[PDB]
């Protein structure tokens, strides 16, 4: 609506509106939380070019924009079944899967 209570958030595409639809606060896919007043953008968080996933009115009192949790490193073994990571006594760190070792440190 026009209000975000504690624990509520705007996700990408979500919005608040007021002034008979003339005013729109919206979290964009470029990452920016923007307030559009009619034709013009009157204010933003300046978070364009950043991977902002939500604008949460937190229960601790703080309204906060967060970038998404992202992967930064992987074994690159998506698709493998029943996997387990084992730190072995031969010092090798091995990712095992249904049809044998999918990834190996050594």
Ligand X SMILES: OC[C@H]1O[C@@H](O)[C@@H](O)[C@@H](O)[C@@H]1O
Ligand Y SMILES: OC[C@H]1O[C@H](O)[C@@H](O)[C@@H](O)[C@@H]1O
Q: Which residues bind ligand X (CB under 6 A)?
A: 58, 60, 62, 64, 71, 74, 78
Considering just the CA atoms, what is the radius of gyration of the chain in Å? 22
Q: Which of 32, 33, 55, 56 binds ligand Y (CB under 6 A)?
A: 32
Q: One symbol per residue from 43 to 82: x for binding a second copy (CB under 8 A), - otherwise; what is it?
A: x-xxx--x-xx---xx-xxxxxxxxxxxxxxxxxxxxxxx
Residue 65: its H or E element: strand 63-67
Least spacing, CB of residue 98 vs a second copy, in Å:
9
Q: What angle do CA 64, 69, 73 make, to 5 degrees?
A: 150
What's the residue count for the chain?
106
Residues 76-105 touching a second copy, rule: CB under 8 A, are: 76-91, 93, 95, 97, 102-103, 105
User: What are the b/e assignments for 17-52, b being 16+ CB within 10 Å?
Assistant: eeeeeeebbbbeeebbbbebeeeeeeebeebeeeeb
Q: Which residues bind ligand Y (CB under 6 A)?
A: 28, 30, 32, 34, 41, 44, 48, 58, 60, 62, 64, 71, 74, 78, 88, 90, 92, 94, 101, 104, 106
């Amino acid at each position: 609506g026009d209000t975000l209570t504690a624990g509520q958030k705007l996700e990408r595409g979500g919005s608040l509106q007021s002034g008979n639809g003339a005013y729109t606060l919206t979290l964009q896919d470029d990452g920016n939380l923007v307030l559009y007043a009619r034709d013009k953008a009157v204010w933003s968080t300046g978070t364009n070019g950043q991977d902002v996933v939500r604008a949460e009115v937190q229960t601790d009192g703080n309204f906060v924009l967060y970038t998404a949790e992202k992967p930064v490193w992987h074994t690159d073994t998506k698709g493998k079944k029943e996997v387990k990571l084992v730190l072995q006594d031969d010092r090798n760190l091995v990712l095992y899967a249904k049809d044998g070792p999918a990834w190996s440190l050594e």
